[PDB]
Amino acid sequence: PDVKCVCCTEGKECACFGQDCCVTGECCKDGTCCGI
Ligand SMILES: [Cd+2]
Ligand SMILES: [Cd+2]
Ligand SMILES: [Cd+2]
Ligand SMILES: [Cd+2]
């Protein structure tokens, strides 16, 4: 309950879950998230 990656901050399916890119949200500040 304290992140920028709505992906995890929401409870959706993440592929980079439990990471730092989730905090910084760098995986949610370019175009989209997830995409193995
Ligand atoms: Cd995430
Ligand atoms: Cd994701
Ligand atoms: Cd991430
Ligand atoms: Cd993300």
**Eight-state DSSP code of residue 30:** S
Give distance in angstroms: CA of 9 to centre of ligand 3: 11
Contacting residues for 32 by C-beta, under 8 A, at least 6 apart: none
The token duo for 22 is: 């989730």
**Eight-state DSSP code of residue 7:** H
Domain count, the chain: 1
Which domain range does residue 2 map to? 1-36
The experimental method, as deposited, was NMR
Nearest ligand by distance to the CA of 16: 3
The token duo for 5 is: 């990656």
Give distance in angstroms: CA of 1 to centre of ligand 2: 16
- The answer to whether residues 29 and 35 touch, using CB atoms and an 8 Å cutoff, is no
Burial class (CB in 10 A: 0-12, 13-18, 19+), 26: middle
Q: How far is CA 31 from CA 1, 26, 34, 35, in A?
A: 23, 10, 10, 11
Contacting residues for 31 by C-beta, under 8 A, at least 6 apart: none
- The answer to whether residues 4 and 25 touch, using CB atoms and an 8 Å cutoff, is yes
**H or E element in which residue 33 lies:** none
Give distance in angstroms: CA of 25 to centre of ligand 2: 10
